[PDB]
């Protein structure tokens, strides 16, 4: 025999009905030929979001500044109106760093 | 019995050896889980959202710190109640951007 190896795929009733539609929408007449082609041609794709790593790292160091401001405000229980608008500026600068490093992509 | 239907695929030894190498290259343990996904979806895509969640988690942390600050600032009459508002708006205006603009990225990656 040309193909003596037999592999089984087990299916639910709905999964089987999906398979039937895919066969009909395919170029192939029957399951054997549909499945053979797709198992051989289907290529696994790996996808990650490492292109954001540069942006994540620049946000992070803004983070550590805002973080130490917060630790200090909490240990001295004081905050000034100058600290508030200074925060606001750091916030609108994060808004800039985000649109910028994301258009770059 | 969750899966009471079986379909059979016949292979040559060389086609079967090719499929084994593919199953090893995927995140699926065995032929069942590999075929089921590939025959119904038509592709296998392993997506790692790790770096994207590291981004949104950092933005979340900054938001916590800012809220701690704004809240405290309510204890001081010299700090305008409507200048704390102007800091809290710009944090939600940044969350908005981060979320939408990152969905535009997840679409340009699911293609």
Residue numbers in the entry:
A (entry chain C): 7 to 111
B (entry chain A): 7 to 117
Original authors' sentences:
The tetracycline-resistance plasmid pCF10 from E. faecalis is a member of the highly transmissible pheromone-responsive family of mobile genetic elements (MGEs) found in enterococci. PcfF binds to double stranded DNA (dsDNA) and is specific for inverted repeat sequences located within pCF10’s origin of transfer (oriT) sequence. PcfF-oriT complexes, however, recruit PcfG to form the relaxosome, as evidenced by supershifting of PcfF-oriT complexes in the presence of PcfG to higher molecular mass complexes in electrophoretic mobility shift assay (EMSA) experiments. Here, we have solved the structure of the accessory factor PcfF, which binds the pCF10 oriT sequence and recruits the PcfG relaxase for relaxosome assembly.
Crystals belonged to space group P21 and contained 4 molecules in the asymmetric unit. The structure was refined at a resolution of 1.9 Å. PcfF crystallized as a tetramer (dimer of dimers in a head to toe organization). However, the tetrameric interface is weak and deemed unstable by PISA calculations. The biologically relevant oligomer was suggested to be dimeric, in agreement with results from the SEC and GEMMA experiments. PcfF contains a RHH domain at the N terminus and a 2-helix bundle, here termed the stalk domain, at the C terminus. These two domains are connected by a hinge region. In the dimer, the RHH and stalk domains are built up by secondary structure elements from both monomers in the dimer. In agreement with findings from other RHH accessory factors, we determined that PcfF binds pCF10’s oriT sequence via its RHH-domain, and that mutation of the surface-exposed charged residues R13 and R16, as well as I14, in the β-sheet strongly abrogate oriT binding in vitro. We gained evidence that this patch mediates binding of PcfF to PcfG by showing that a single point mutation (I70S) abolishes PcfF-PcfG binding.
